[PDB]
UniProtKB/Swiss-Prot annotation, chain A:
Compartment(s): Cytoplasm; Cell projection, Cilium, Flagellum
Top-level taxon of the source organism: Eukaryota
Binding-site residues, Ca(2+) 1: 60, 62, 69
Gene field: Efcab9
Protein name as it appears in the record: EF-hand calcium-binding domain-containing protein 9
GO molecular function per UniProt: calcium ion binding; calcium ion sensor activity; calmodulin binding
Covered range of the whole protein: 1 to 174 of 216
Native organism: Mus musculus (Mouse)
Swiss-Prot record, chain B:
Subcellular location as annotated: Cell projection, Cilium, Flagellum membrane
Null mutant phenotype: Mice are normal but males are sterile. Male sterility is due to defects in sperm motility unability to fertilize intact eggs.
Similarity comment: family membership: Belongs to the cation channel sperm-associated (TC 1.A.1.19) family.
Source organism of the structure: Mus musculus (Mouse)
Tissue localization of expression: Testis-specific.
Name of the protein this chain belongs to: Cation channel sperm-associated protein 3
Superkingdom classification of source: Eukaryota
Residues of the full protein shown: 284 to 315 of 395
Assembly information from the UniProt record: Component of the CatSper complex or CatSpermasome composed of the core pore-forming members CATSPER1, CATSPER2, CATSPER3 and CATSPER4 as well as auxiliary members CATSPERB, CATSPERG2, CATSPERD, CATSPERE, CATSPERZ, C2CD6/CATSPERT, SLCO6C1, TMEM249, TMEM262 and EFCAB9. HSPA1 may be an additional auxiliary complex member. The core complex members CATSPER1, CATSPER2, CATSPER3 and CATSPER4 form a heterotetrameric channel.
Task of the protein: Pore-forming subunit of the CatSper complex, a sperm-specific voltage-gated calcium channel that plays a central role in sperm cell hyperactivation. Controls calcium entry to mediate the hyperactivated motility, a step needed for sperm motility which is essential late in the preparation of sperm for fertilization.
UniProtKB/Swiss-Prot annotation, chain C:
Cellular component GO terms, alphabetical: CatSper complex; cytoplasm; sperm principal piece
Disulphide connectivity of cysteines: none
Compartments, record wording: Cell projection, Cilium, Flagellum membrane
Protein name: Cation channel sperm-associated auxiliary subunit zeta
Organism classification: Eukaryota, Metazoa, Chordata, Craniata, Vertebrata
Gene: Catsperz
Assembly behavior: Component of the CatSper complex or CatSpermasome composed of the core pore-forming members CATSPER1, CATSPER2, CATSPER3 and CATSPER4 as well as auxiliary members CATSPERB, CATSPERG2, CATSPERD, CATSPERE, CATSPERZ, C2CD6/CATSPERT, SLCO6C1, TMEM249, TMEM262 and EFCAB9. HSPA1 may be an additional auxiliary complex member. The core complex members CATSPER1, CATSPER2, CATSPER3 and CATSPER4 form a heterotetrameric channel.
Span within the parent record: 38 to 186 of 194
Tissue specificity as recorded in UniProt: Testis-specific. Expressed in adult but not in fetal testis. Not expressed in ovary. Within testis, expression is restricted to spermatids.
Keywords: Cell membrane, Cell projection, Cilium, Differentiation, Flagellum, Membrane, Spermatogenesis
Membrane topology label: Peripheral membrane protein
Species this protein is from: Mus musculus (Mouse)
Length: 174, 32, 143
């Protein structure tokens, strides 16, 4: 079974949302998870997750700790293989400029990932955490925050987030 | 009200750009 | 010591159909000539790059795939990675085409794993942490 039916459906969706599907992307991420999971519990302890990011992306350990918390919505103290696979997919060669356009497109939720609270409104702290993950100037983040915050409630709702992403994507394509 | 006017102008400009982009895409599709 | 059948490393794996085996022979001959002439490593890499480009650069009219491949080889990052994939493939064919070590290495790998697993299953001690560190170290160096 193509690494399970759900992964194959995600791969078709990834091919649709990515100009280059690439070769065995899912298998490579699964192999990396297997190497970390010598125990094969199907979950990764914090040390394994932190070390892999340090080994490949050379990320700050404190930044990796924030990333671990966002990925571990279950908060069981371990990272599931799907969460680890999604996190590598989220970076997707983060250094490359082309990835930033794909990162702006995000995924089918397109707002849920930014909204850690899940209240349908994104807090300023959540945006700051995203800025640590994706490099953006603090003044630039404030300017984007003001443009989206027409209400003045300092919260981003889903429809506004979708429109804000669409406007930036259209400008980037232009 | 002034803030309302600005927001509606920005929304109309968004709609204008969307229509322009779709029109250019249709032109490229037909001519290609 | 690839330990991969010759039949796998040279299944004429190149996506364009140019055999791997002919490319290898051309590089082997080029290098033998150049060693006689004492060509510098930078010069050897440049010539080898050009031959890879030409293998893909055979008339580009014979299928679009050759243009996309030559173009990719024309860039510097993808070419370095493409060339560096085919070079060890060519090496593996050459060495396999031409056991106690493999048994030793497999034994060392399993010994390391058993220890890694026992450590993970087992806790706040410096030694355990030091060892976990070395283990991540070895896995990263291996990767």
């Amino acid at each position: 079974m193509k690494l399970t039916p759900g992964c194959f459906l995600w791969y078709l969706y990834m091919d649709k949302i990515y100009c280059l599907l690439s070769l065995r992307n899912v298998k490579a991420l699964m192999v990396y998870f297997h190497l970390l999971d010598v125990h094969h519990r199907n979950t990764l302890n914090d040390v394994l997750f932190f070390h892999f990011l340090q080994h490949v992306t050379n990320l700050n350990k404190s930044q990796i700790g924030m990333i671990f918390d966002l990925l571990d919505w279950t908060a069981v103290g371990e990272i599931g293989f799907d969460q680890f696979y999604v996190l590598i997919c989220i970076l997707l060669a983060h250094q490359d400029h082309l990835e930033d356009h794909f990162m702006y497109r995000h995924s089918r939720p397109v707002f849920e990932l930014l909204d850690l609270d899940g209240e349908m409104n994104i807090g300023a702290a959540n945006f700051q955490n995203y800025r640590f993950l994706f490099n953006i100037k603090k003044q630039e983040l404030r300017d984007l925050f003001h443009d989206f915050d027409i209400t003045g409630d300092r919260l981003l709702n889903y429809k506004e987030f979708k429109l804000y992403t669409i406007f930036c994507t259209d400008k980037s394509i232009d | 009200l002034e803030r309302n006017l600005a927001i509606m102008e920005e929304k109309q400009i968004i709609l204008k750009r969307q229509q322009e982009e779709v029109n250019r895409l249709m032109n490229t599709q037909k001519s290609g | 010591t690839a330990n991969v059948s010759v039949s796998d490393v040279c299944e004429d794996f190149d996506e364009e159909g140019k055999s791997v085996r002919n490319r290898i022979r051309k590089y082997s001959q080029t290098i033998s000539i150049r060693d006689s002439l004492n060509l510098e490593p930078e010069e050897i890499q440049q010539q080898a790059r050009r031959e890879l480009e030409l293998c893909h650069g055979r008339s580009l009219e014979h299928g679009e795939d050759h243009e996309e491949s030559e173009t990719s080889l024309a860039s510097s990052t993808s070419e370095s990675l493409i060339f560096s994939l085919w070079k060890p493939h060519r090496t593996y064919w050459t060495e396999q085409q031409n056991l106690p070590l493999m048994e030793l290495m497999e034994t060392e790998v399993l010994d390391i794993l058993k220890k890694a697993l026992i450590t993970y299953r087992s806790r706040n001690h410096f030694m355990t942490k030091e060892l976990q560190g070395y283990i991540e170290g070895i896995r990263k160096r291996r990767n």
